[PDB]
Paper text:
This enables the formation of large sheets where Shank proteins multimerize, allowing Shank proteins to serve as building blocks in deeper layers of the PSD.
Upon solving the structure of the WT, we observed high similarity between the Shank2-SAM domain, and the structure of M56E mutant Shank3-SAM domain. Though no Zn2+ was added to Shank2 crystals, we observed that about 30% of the Zn2+ sites were occupied. Due to the incomplete occupancy, the tetrahedral coordination of the Zn2+ ion made by His1803, His1835, a chloride ion and Glu1802 was somewhat distorted and incomplete. Nevertheless, the WT SAM domain crystallized in the same space group, showing the same crystal packing as reported for Shank3. Importantly, this packing arrangement allowed for the formation of helical polymers of SAM domains, and the side-by-side alignment of these helices, leading to larger sheets of polymerized SAM domains. A closer inspection of the interactions of SAM domains within the crystals showed that the WT domain established several interactions with the neighboring molecules, which are responsible for the formation of helical fibers. In addition, we observed interactions to SAM domains in the neighboring helix.
Numbering used by the authors: 1780 to 1849
Amino acid sequence: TKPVHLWTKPDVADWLESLNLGEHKEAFMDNEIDGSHLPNLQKEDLIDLGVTRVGHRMNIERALKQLLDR
Ligand SMILES: [Cl-]
Ligand SMILES: [Zn+2]
């Protein structure tokens, strides 16, 4: 599998699907979110991408901690 920094936009869509965060795929793709963006996303970016529910941002924050060992 690819290092995260090399994830294309669809690779991020696949990852979101895998997290049962599929309803965010279109926003992440329409906003040009690739693997290089994931380490840099702030809460305000996740809000701008339509991730308005606390639980769903916490799911993304949790997943990224394990992906990027932060
Ligand atoms: Cl949400
Ligand atoms: Zn959501």
